[PDB]
Amino acid sequence: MDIDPYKEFGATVELLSFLPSDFFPSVRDLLDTASALYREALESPEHCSPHHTALRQAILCWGELMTLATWVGVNLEDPASRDLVVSYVNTNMGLKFRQLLWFHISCLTFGRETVIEYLVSFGVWIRTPPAYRPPNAPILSTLPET
Amino acid sequence: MDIDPYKEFGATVELLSFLPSDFFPSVRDLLDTASALYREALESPEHCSPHHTALRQAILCWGELMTLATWVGVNLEDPASRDLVVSYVNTNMGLKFRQLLWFHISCLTFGRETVIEYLVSFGVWIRTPPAYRPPNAPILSTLPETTVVRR
Amino acid sequence: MDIDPYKEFGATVELLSFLPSDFFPSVRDLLDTASALYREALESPEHCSPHHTALRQAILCWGELMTLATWVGVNLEDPASRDLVVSYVNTNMGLKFRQLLWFHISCLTFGRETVIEYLVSFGVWIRTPPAYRPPNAPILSTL
Amino acid sequence: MDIDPYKEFGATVELLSFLPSDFFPSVRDLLDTASALYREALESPEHCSPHHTALRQAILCWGELMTLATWVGVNLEDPASRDLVVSYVNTNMGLKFRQLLWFHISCLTFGRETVIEYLVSFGVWIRTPPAYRPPNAPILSTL
Amino acid sequence: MDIDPYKEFGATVELLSFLPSDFFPSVRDLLDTASALYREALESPEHCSPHHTALRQAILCWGELMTLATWVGVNLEDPASRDLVVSYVNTNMGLKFRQLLWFHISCLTFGRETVIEYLVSFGVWIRTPPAYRPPNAPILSTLPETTVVRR
Amino acid sequence: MDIDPYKEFGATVELLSFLPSDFFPSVRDLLDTASALYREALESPEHCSPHHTALRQAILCWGELMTLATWVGVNLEDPASRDLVVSYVNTNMGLKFRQLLWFHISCLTFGRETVIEYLVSFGVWIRTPPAYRPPNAPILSTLPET
């Protein structure tokens, strides 16, 4: 079908592409963050959020992708095609997967509407010329002010 | 017909004339901003606002200009004239379209009165020689001058 | 973004396609009509209507296109490429621009709904084979 | 002073420009129509209407012009200059005078607003290209 | 008659002398600003304010001076004296006109008391020697610089 | 812009041109009259009228024009162009300046509406043939009748 995973939460693939691709963290860092913070909740029998549900699904999808990478590295003799497919998996699919993981984790942490507003503001700040914008790049924090 | 596109919305050409050419982002950046923010409203059959209407019209003009640039690059085997026309289109007319798109988008985003007050203050800042003015120009943003998002 | 300009006004490119391209008046005649009727309203500092807004936008766009044509005729030495560019601007782009001007002006004048029923009725009259097509084609009026 | 005569009545020179010059009837036919319909009102000692006032003024102006033509034909010996002046008076000035007479008479007859919508509708019909221009052009009536 | 055009409004020539002569913008930029956001009032038949009245008078004087410059460039076959007169008019006579225009425009926009206290504060900032002079100077502005607005 | 200085008071350049140009007094006489009558008010920090404001502005404009004439007479060696520019300043610009000064001073003295009515009546009297008009030319006075 024509399914946008972000629209049920209030965003779009176009909105998450409004940001650079080099901005999103690594799949490993995102998974470590998730395991550090929301592990008990993801491993629980209760849903506890659509965010939690989608996050479980994405984590398992990426685990299957890593299993595929390993099966390739083993059963494929051609080093060219081997490394080629592995690079494809790690980069092209990893980009979307870390987009999704970042979105859901940042939502759970700070706030869904907050994350959406941050997407918009950062995508505008990056396209604004430097002299006519704030110097520091936007960022999300849970550390209150004084 | 002596028409000012900004007089309808309360601004004026002489008011935006003080904005340098380096202040406006690229046409592509502005179009991406619009398509990411107000796309479902621009593609909507409802007159959401005059800003939306003018934005649609400007986007379509720019699409036709891109079509023209492509047709030129194809049908003009004279590289000199071809590149010359393409540069004119992308620079001189692109400047006006950047101006217009930026005005309408910034209005939709922040507030029309806010944008107009910002333009006034920025004209004041830019008309001043550099020595007798602060180094950093005014900034229009929904964020604080410190870019941090809690909640 | 695929932005149909006539969607917010209740029509579509596929709906105006009922009209041929040779049916539309000249940009000059359309602009003369506009300047004769709605000049003071287009020069006005008010959102008189969305049609007024779009009409201002289109007029300024066409003015910039004429500026382009003149700048070309001046700064370009190759007469072949010069004439090619000028003819393209005048004909191909002018087609869409007079489509738009005609639509919005006919709206202002006769009614948006009236223009829409005119479009459908002209589509009927043109789909009609010639043997049974009446000579007097549809047209707008107020009398 | 730039005094548009049709402004106080709701039209403009640019609006009547929609009408060609060969479209207007002859001064003689217009005056015959006036004398057949509104003669007793124009000879009346009352401000029947601003149209009546302007019509009286125009008729007297044209009468003085005819007097000029006759005085020329009498007192001028150079037939070249005589014919030149007479032709100029009859054609160039007669054009404006029959414009004015037609406007005011059609007002009296059918309605000022009706005349205005007629002007705009005729502008449409004439901007229309011939292939899609209906043969039957707009016209005023009461039936 | 000692006619200080600024004491009618609360200032003086000596109060505006705090501002250097190179601080004032161009006559053309000032005219564009006026035409942009006070014109409908300037052309009105109503006494909007003494600022408006004095501004009308100054604009008309400057228009007549431009007329004079043109008439000179036309009727003076001596290019030397021609350019001399033209440069005098453009620079020496125009300095005072742009002083006056800046004053009245800024008083119409940001207020009169604000402009006066701004003159005072800028006089302080400029009397201050450079080693102890802050980088940023007083700059008239309704908008705070880092204005992050979310809607 | 398109600015008429007389319309904010209720007159026009066309209305002040409705009178002859040889009718207006000299700039010197007008300035002497102003200094004799309204000097304290023009030198005061209070506005006291739009008339007073415009009059101050015009006086200073004419002072700058005289300064220009002097600077010319000094720095210009060519006597032809020197006298030419000086005559232009004195005559062409002086005409408008004395029109303005006369208008504002007569307003302050007698009455704005009175001055307007006088403009109209005098411009009609001058164009009327002599035999069919009053013989004496109109004039403004503050001297009441008996």
Cβ contact C56–B3 (<8 Å): yes
C-alpha span between D102 and D108 (Å, rounded): 10
Residue of A nearest to B118 (CA): A132
C-alpha span between D17 and C28 (Å, rounded): 14
C-alpha span between F39 and C6 (Å, rounded): 67
C-alpha span between D104 and D96 (Å, rounded): 12
Cβ contact E59–F7 (<8 Å): no
For residue A17, give the 3-state DSSP assignment: helix
| Cβ C42 vs Cβ B3: under 8 Å | yes
- Based on its alpha-carbon atoms, the radius of gyration of chain D, rounded to whole angstroms, reads 17
Residue of C nearest to D118 (CA): C143
Residue of B nearest to C96 (CA): B64
Contacts of F39 in chain E (CB under 8 A): 1
Contacts of C30 in chain D (CB under 8 A): 127
Which distant-in-sequence residues (6+ apart) come within 8 Å of F16 by Cβ?
Answer: F6, F99, F103, F119
Q: Which residues of E touch B (CB under 8 A)?
A: 20, 22-23, 25-26, 29, 32-33, 35-37, 109, 135-137, 139-143, 145-151
Burial of B69 (C-beta count, 10 Å sphere; 0-12/13-18/19+) = middle
C-alpha span between B119 and B103 (Å, rounded): 10
| Cβ A124 vs Cβ B136: under 8 Å | no
Other C-beta atoms lying within 10 Å of the C-beta of residue A113: 11
Cβ contact A127–B29 (<8 Å): yes
Token pair for B109: 């985003």
Instruction: Give the closest-approach CA distance of B133 to chain C in angstroms.
Output: 33
C-alpha span between A94 and A69 (Å, rounded): 12
Residue with the two structure tokens 């029998």: A45
C-alpha span between A57 and E19 (Å, rounded): 68
Which distant-in-sequence residues (6+ apart) come within 8 Å of C89 by Cβ?
Answer: B68, C65, C68, C69
C-alpha span between C100 and C116 (Å, rounded): 14
The distance between the two most distant Cα atoms of chain A, rounded to a whole number of Å, is 60
Contacts of E23 in chain B (CB under 8 A): 128-129, 132
Check contact E-F (3+ Cβ pairs < 8 Å). Answer: yes
Residue of B nearest to C34 (CA): B1
Token pair for B46: 């409802």
- Phi, psi values for residue E15, rounded to 5°: -75, -35
C-alpha span between E38 and E34 (Å, rounded): 5
C-alpha span between C48 and B53 (Å, rounded): 13
Q: Angle C85-C86-C90 (CA atoms, 0-180°, nearest 5)? A: 120
Contacts of A117 in chain B (CB under 8 A): 149
Nearest to E107 by CA among E43, E20, E49, E46: E49
SS3 of chain F? CCCCCCCCCCCCHHHHHCCCCCCCCCHHHHHHHHHHHCHHHHCCCCCCCHHHHHHHHHHHHHHHHHHHHHHHHHHCCCHHHHHHHHHHHHHHHHHHHHHHHHHHHHHHHHCHHHHHHHHHHHHHHHHCCCCCCCCCCCCCCCCCCC
Cβ contact A134–E150 (<8 Å): no
- Resolution, given in Å to one decimal, reads 2.8
CA A50 and chain centroid, separation: 15
Cβ contact C22–D131 (<8 Å): yes
Type of residue numbered C110: F
C-alpha span between D101 and D96 (Å, rounded): 9
Residue of B nearest to E105 (CA): B124
Contacts of B2 in chain C (CB under 8 A): 43
Other C-beta atoms lying within 10 Å of the C-beta of residue F4: 16
C-alpha span between F16 and F36 (Å, rounded): 24
The DSSP result for E70-122, as a single string, is HHHHHH---HHHHHHHHHHIIIIIHHHHHHHHHHHHHHHHH-HHHHHHHHHHH
Listed as own residue / partner, the contacts of E87-96 with beta carbons closer than 8 Å and 24 or more positions apart are E88/F68, E88/F71, E88/F72, E88/F75, E89/E65, E89/F68, E92/F71, E93/E65, E93/F64, E93/F68, E94/E27, E94/E62, E94/E65, E95/E21, E95/E24, E96/F64
C-alpha span between B136 and F83 (Å, rounded): 52
* Overall number of domains in chain A: 1
Residue with the two structure tokens 């006579």: E93
For residue A88, give the 3-state DSSP assignment: helix
Nearest to E8 by CA among E104, E120, E121, E99: E104
Residue with the two structure tokens 């010069």: C82
Other C-beta atoms lying within 10 Å of the C-beta of residue B82: 19
The DSSP result for B12-69, as a single string, is -HHHHTTS-TTSS--HHHHHHHHHHHSHHHHTSSS---HHHHHHHHHHHHHHHHHHHH
Cβ contact A134–E146 (<8 Å): yes
Method: cryo-EM
Nearest to F78 by CA among E87, E71, E91, E72: E72
Nearest to E137 by CA among B127, B130, B122, B133: B133
C-alpha span between C71 and C127 (Å, rounded): 43
Residue of B nearest to A120 (CA): B37
Burial of F59 (C-beta count, 10 Å sphere; 0-12/13-18/19+) = buried
Nearest to B58 by CA among B86, B85, B98: B98
Cβ contact F78–E82 (<8 Å): no
Cβ contact B61–C56 (<8 Å): no
Identify from F6, F77, F85 which residue to disrupt to test chain E contact, counting E C-beta atoms within 10 A and taking the largest count: F85
| Cβ A58 vs Cβ A104: under 8 Å | yes
Nearest to B138 by CA among B19, B12, B9: B19
| Cβ E51 vs Cβ F50: under 8 Å | no
Contacts of E27 in chain B (CB under 8 A): none
C-alpha pair distances (Å), B119 with each of A127, B20, B106, B126, E102: 19, 12, 11, 10, 17
Nearest to A124 by CA among B110, E149, B30, B35: B30
Token pair for D10: 């709701």
C-alpha span between E142 and B20 (Å, rounded): 21
Domain that holds residue B92: 1-151
Cβ contact B135–E136 (<8 Å): yes
Which distant-in-sequence residues (6+ apart) come within 8 Å of B10 by Cβ?
Answer: B112, B116, C45
CA B112 and chain centroid, separation: 14
C-alpha span between E99 and E93 (Å, rounded): 11
Residue with the two structure tokens 């007698």: F110
